[PDB]
Amino acid sequence: YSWDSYLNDRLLATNQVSGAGLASEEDGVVYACVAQGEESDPNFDKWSLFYKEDYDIEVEDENGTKTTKTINEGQTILVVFNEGYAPDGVWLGGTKYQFINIERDLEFEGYNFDVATCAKLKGGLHLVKVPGGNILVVLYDEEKEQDRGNSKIAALTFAKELAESSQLQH
């Protein structure tokens, strides 16, 4: 597909998320995305929310020790599903999110899902493994009448649609 159409009609049309993308499970790199930017900003760059090439960050531990870490953003998404923790945080689009929770085999209306949630200032994201070996990335923005609970139901509802038609395979 051109996944943009689909993401917009099925997910962004809800008004419950600020953005949505698909990542490959192989590298965790978002390859299709939409952002509610629209009003909003018309020269708004949706990719700015979802993609950023490898960069170094400076970290200071409690000791006062300063190190550099090279952030590969996709990898920070894979570590949460692969290991169940985030040694560096989850980074997306240059923004740091805090890993709050992972729920494996969460039951949503007939289907099971691995779903992770991370937080930023006045927002966050949900990550859901969906078929085709994809990760669904959903953003929410508390300044836009969105919240963590409703964006997650919205992410799960979209994942269920994908899981259902993935089972028409003929």
Side-chain angles (χ1 to χ4, degrees):
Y1 332 34
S2 160
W3 282 97
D4 284 12
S5 330
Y6 201 57
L7 292 170
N8 227 288
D9 292 344
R10 319 302 333 173
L11 200 35
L12 227 71
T14 63
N15 298 140
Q16 293 303 323
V17 311
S18 54
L22 288 164
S24 182
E25 186 175 349
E26 274 62 32
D27 61 19
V29 170
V30 169
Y31 63 82
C33 73
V34 301
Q36 92 193 141
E38 180 57 11
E39 161 143 41
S40 111
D41 249 321
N43 299 318
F44 185 78
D45 188 8
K46 51 184 191 161
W47 284 100
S48 61
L49 292 175
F50 284 104
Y51 185 64
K52 190 168 174 204
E53 82 170 15
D54 274 27
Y55 51 107
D56 293 355
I57 65 162
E58 224 253 54
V59 184
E60 179 177 356
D61 69 36
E62 306 288 43
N63 288 336
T65 299
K66 301 150 188 252
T67 56
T68 313
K69 307 178 167 184
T70 286
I71 297 304
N72 183 301
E73 294 196 331
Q75 283 309 149
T76 68
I77 281 182
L78 295 189
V79 67
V80 161
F81 289 98
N82 292 345
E83 314 294 340
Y85 54 83
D88 308 292
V90 179
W91 288 78
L92 185 71
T95 301
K96 196 190 180 184
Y97 304 68
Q98 188 204 347
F99 176 51
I100 296 297
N101 206 14
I102 180 133
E103 276 155 348
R104 306 195 188 258
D105 262 28
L106 177 145
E107 311 190 352
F108 181 86
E109 314 192 347
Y111 298 87
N112 292 32
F113 295 107
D114 289 354
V115 47
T117 280
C118 306
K120 45 156 283 159
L121 176 55
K122 303 184 86 165
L125 64 65
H126 304 284
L127 305 163
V128 193
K129 279 199 169 178
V130 305
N134 285 116
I135 304 170
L136 169 75
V137 196
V138 168
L139 312 189
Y140 73 89
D141 179 344
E142 291 177 357
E143 299 181 295
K144 299 223 187 318
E145 277 208 31
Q146 302 159 10
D147 61 43
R148 175 181 296 173
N150 216 329
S151 60
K152 178 186 195 179
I153 285 292
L156 289 177
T157 295
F158 188 70
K160 183 204 194 331
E161 304 173 27
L162 297 171
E164 268 169 339
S165 69
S166 146
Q167 281 162 45
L168 341 197
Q169 51 195 34
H170 52 30

